[PDB]
C-alpha cells in the first residue's frame, strides 16, 4: 500500500468505426471449480459463525 | 461493362476523350453493389494512366475525376489499395494537397484519408511520405465544413493504431491543430478531433504528457457534458486514457472538475458510457488519499453502489474496481464510509463469478475492510471485528468458504487465510 501501480489501461481500442456496436453481453457465471483430486488434496475450513 | 471505346479514349492524346472516358469509369465504379473493379484493374496500364492524369496541373476537372476514380478503386479493399499505392498515387495525392483547385485538394485529402486508414502498413506509409505538413497546412485557411471534415478525418486515421502504434514523433505535430478543433461547433469535426486525441492519449506516460501539454484537458472535460453520444464517447475515452498516468497527470484531469461530469455519466442510458465512466473513476480512486477523498466529496460512491446492483455485468466489473481501489488506498475513516454505504454486499455477490479476476478484486476489497475492523477491534471493546458480521450476513462468508474449491490455487489460499484469520474454523 505504498508505491504500487493501481492504474489500468483500457482493454479494447475504441474507434470511429467501432464505438457503437453494443458488443456481446457478459455471462456472470460460476467460478471454475478445482479438480476432484485437488479438492480432496487441500485442507478446507469451516468458518466459525455467530451473528 | 467496360468497352474498348473507353479504353481508346483514355489512351488517346485529346484531353477531351480522356476526361469523358474517366467519368464513365468512376460512375461505374460508383455502383455500391459490385463495381467492375476487377475488369478495370485487369486492363493493363489503366491504373497507371489514371495516376498520370493526376499530374495535369492545367486540368482541374480531369485531375478531380482521376483522383475520384483511384479512390473508388482503393477504398473498400486492402488489395486494390495496394495496387493503387503501387502505381505511385500517394506521393502525388500528397502533391495535390498544395494545388490552386481546392476541389482537387479536398479529393486528395479524402483519398489519402482512405488509404492511411486501410491498415497499420498504409498509415505508416502515407506518413513516411510527409502527408502531415501540407495536410496540417490546409487548416490554416478558412475552409468549408467539407474540406475540414475530410482533413480532420484524415488525421484521425493517421493517429489510429494500437499495434503497432505510429511513431509518436510523426503524429504529435498535429496536436496543436487538434486542440483548436475542439472548439468547432460541428459534431463531425468535433468527434474526429476527439478520436485522434483519444488515440494519442493511449499509451505510456510520456505520450500522455504530450496530449496534456497541448492544453486539451479543460475542453475535453467540458465535452463530457455534450448531448451527442458520438462526441461524448471519444471524449470520455481520451479523458479516461489521461487518468492512466501518474497522480500528477490525473490531478490535471481532476482540477478540471471532471468528477461531477463523470457522476452525471453514471446515470447515462448508454451502458457503454457508464462502463467507461466507472473505468475512469476506477483509475482515479487508484490514486492518492486526497484524490480518493475528492471522489467521495464528488458524491460519487452512492452511484457506484447502485451501479453494482442495477447496471450490466461488464459495467459492474469496472465499478467493483473503483471500490476496491479506494479500499486499498483509503484511510480508516474513508473505508468506514464506503462500508456505511453498504459496499460489503455488492462485493460479496461477485465472489462466485466466472472471471477469476473480478473474484480477486472482490476478495481484495473484503480483505482491506476486514483489516480495518481488525483495527477497530483492539482500540475499542469488546474488541470483535464489526465487519465480518456484516460480511456473514451478506452471504460473503458462505462464498469465501466455497472459494476454497476454486481452480486457482492463490484464490483458494486467500479464502483459506481470510477464514482462519478473521473468523476461524474449529
Curated annotation (Swiss-Prot), chain A:
Region entry Disordered, spans: 5-30
Residues recorded as bearing N6-acetyllysine in the entry: 12
Compositional bias of kind Basic and acidic residues: 5-20
Tissue expression per record: Ubiquitous. Highest levels in testis, peripheral blood leukocytes and fetal liver.
Locations listed in the record: Nucleus, Nuclear pore complex; Nucleus membrane
Function: Component of the nuclear pore complex that has a direct role in nuclear protein import. Actively displaces NLSs from importin-alpha, and facilitates disassembly of the importin-alpha:beta-cargo complex and importin recycling. Interacts with regulatory proteins of cell cycle progression including CDKN1B. This interaction is required for correct intracellular transport and degradation of CDKN1B.
Subunit structure: Interacts with Importin alpha-2, Importin beta, Importin beta-2, NUP153, Ran binding protein 7, CDKN1B and itself. Does not interact with TPR.
Domain commentary: Contains FG repeats. FG repeats are interaction sites for karyopherins (importins, exportins) and form probably an affinity gradient, guiding the transport proteins unidirectionally with their cargo through the NPC. FG repeat regions are highly flexible and lack ordered secondary structure. The overall conservation of FG repeats regarding exact sequence, spacing, and repeat unit length is limited.
Stated name of the protein: Nuclear pore complex protein Nup50
From Swiss-Prot, chain B:
Stated family: Belongs to the importin alpha family.
GO MF annotation list: nuclear import signal receptor activity; nuclear localization sequence binding
Free-text function comment from the UniProt entry: Functions in nuclear protein import as an adapter protein for nuclear receptor KPNB1. Binds specifically and directly to substrates containing either a simple or bipartite NLS motif. Docking of the importin/substrate complex to the nuclear pore complex (NPC) is mediated by KPNB1 through binding to nucleoporin FxFG repeats and the complex is subsequently translocated through the pore by an energy requiring, Ran-dependent mechanism.
Keywords of the record: Acetylation, Cytoplasm, Host-virus interaction, Nucleus, Phosphoprotein, Protein transport, Repeat, Transport, Ubl conjugation
Region forming the signal peptide: none
Annotated Gene Ontology cellular component terms: cytoplasm; cytosol; dendrite; glutamatergic synapse; NLS-dependent protein nuclear import complex; nuclear pore; nucleoplasm; nucleus
GO biological process: NLS-bearing protein import into nucleus; postsynapse to nucleus signaling pathway; protein import into nucleus; regulation of apoptotic process; regulation of canonical Wnt signaling pathway; regulation of DNA recombination; satellite cell activation involved in skeletal muscle regeneration; skeletal muscle satellite cell proliferation
Region described as NLS binding site (major): spans on this chain: 68-160
Record-given protein name: Importin subunit alpha-5
ARM repeat ranges, renumbered to this chain: 1-36, 37-80, 81-125, 126-164, 165-209, 210-249, 250-291, 292-331, 332-376, 379-423
Subcellular location: Cytoplasm; Nucleus
Subunit organization: Heterodimer; with KPNB1. Interacts with ANP32E. Interacts with ZIC3. Interacts with NSMF; the interaction occurs in a calcium-independent manner after synaptic NMDA receptor stimulation and is required for nuclear import of NSMF but is competed by CABP1. Interacts with APEX1. Interacts with RAG1. Interacts with CTNNBL1 (via its N-terminal). Interacts with AICDA (via its NLS). Interacts with SNAI1 (via zinc fingers). Interacts with DCAF8. Interacts with ITSN1 isoform 2. Interacts with TALDO1 isoform 1.
Keyword Ligase: no
Region of interest (NLS binding site (minor)), residue spans: 237-325
Entry PTM: Polyubiquitinated in the presence of RAG1 (in vitro).
Stretches for region Binding to RAG1: 164-356
Principal place of residence: cytoplasm
Gene: KPNA1
Residues passing through the membrane, by range: none
Tissue-specificity statement: Expressed ubiquitously.
Record carries keyword Cytoplasm: yes
